[PDB]
Amino acid sequence: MENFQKVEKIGEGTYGVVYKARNKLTGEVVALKKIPSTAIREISLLKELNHPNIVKLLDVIHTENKLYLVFEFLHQDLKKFMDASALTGIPLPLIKSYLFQLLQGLAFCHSHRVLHRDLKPQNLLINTEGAIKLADFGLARAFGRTYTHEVVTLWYRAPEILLGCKYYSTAVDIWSLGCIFAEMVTRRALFPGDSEIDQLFRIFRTLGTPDEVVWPGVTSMPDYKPSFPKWARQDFSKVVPPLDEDGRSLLSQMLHYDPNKRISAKAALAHPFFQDVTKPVPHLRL
Ligand SMILES: O=C(O)c1ccc(C(=O)Nc2cc(C3CC3)[nH]n2)cc1
């Protein structure tokens, strides 16, 4: 760490503090995250998982029982960009470009059997060129409230996780990305739960209480209760106006209850919603 000069604190992650820093050897500006042997091996496998839509893991430094992850630096996150675009909304061509790029990122990681598990706007990073990249890919499998006691958000958690499936699939990331897509369109979180049951019931109130018809095996899941209230499903036309029919079709497939029915990232890239995809330049002031 004597090779790095901390510039400023940029955030507080799930695992630890994130700093903007300068590498004294190469002159490189980086993001530094301050965090057992199985974790070292798993994190080292992530240095190989390189893609233009994945924030690059430059190095892993293990010194004096402290773990530092050195990443490529990006100047803004999607949470801040959405907050900044609250009054006007992010233009549809830019939402479409970001969704397409994130699906390319997911298709790559999923093809290597790597899941993110905790996608949220805070870990989607953007640059001036129109790119968007996934941060913290693979860290959940390695490390499992934050270190500052901040509550870890449940808003993007898939229903199978909330229902106690411990052997969940790549479909959990498609659910989270569908929640983010809906939030970019409407300018409001889709399911802003503030407890596990509030999160589940917000999902049920919009998509209908799941049953054996729509999700075979649901009633036998660990945290499923026959006493859950039975809510009827809402039309997507009410949930995400003014999204067009192609976008609503794709969103519905990303939010299917059964993880086996939920669209894969690869199949989502072929959806007609992306027929007219482009790569616009966002409005960024840094
Ligand atoms: O509002 C701002 O100034 C601002 C600046 C930087 C960021 C940001 O998280 N950057 C990062 C993080 C990472 C990897 C995952 C460690 N790389 N780059 C977010 C907001």
UniProtKB/Swiss-Prot annotation:
This is Cyclin-dependent kinase 2. The gene is CDK2. Mg(2+) binds at residues 123, 136. It catalyses: L-seryl-[protein] + ATP = O-phospho-L-seryl-[protein] + ADP + H(+); L-threonyl-[protein] + ATP = O-phospho-L-threonyl-[protein] + ADP + H(+). The lineage of its organism: Eukaryota, Metazoa, Chordata, Craniata, Vertebrata. The modification Phosphotyrosine is found at residues 15, 19. Its cofactor is Mg(2+). GO terms for biological process: cell division; cellular response to nitric oxide; cellular senescence; centriole replication; centrosome duplication; chromatin remodeling; DNA repair; DNA replication. The active site is at residue 118. GO terms for molecular function: ATP binding; cyclin binding; cyclin-dependent protein kinase activity; cyclin-dependent protein serine/threonine kinase activity; magnesium ion binding; protein domain specific binding; protein serine kinase activity; protein serine/threonine kinase activity. GO terms for cellular component: Cajal body; centrosome; chromosome, telomeric region; condensed chromosome; cyclin A1-CDK2 complex; cyclin A2-CDK2 complex; cyclin E1-CDK2 complex; cyclin E2-CDK2 complex. Induction: Induced transiently by TGFB1 at an early phase of TGFB1-mediated apoptosis. Phosphorylated at Thr-148 by CDK7 in a CAK complex. Phosphorylation at Thr-148 promotes kinase activity, whereas phosphorylation at Tyr-15 by WEE1 reduces slightly kinase activity. Phosphorylated on Thr-14 and Tyr-15 during S and G2 phases before being dephosphorylated by CDC25A. Phosphorylation at Thr-14 or Tyr-15 inactivates the enzyme, while phosphorylation at Thr-148 activates it.
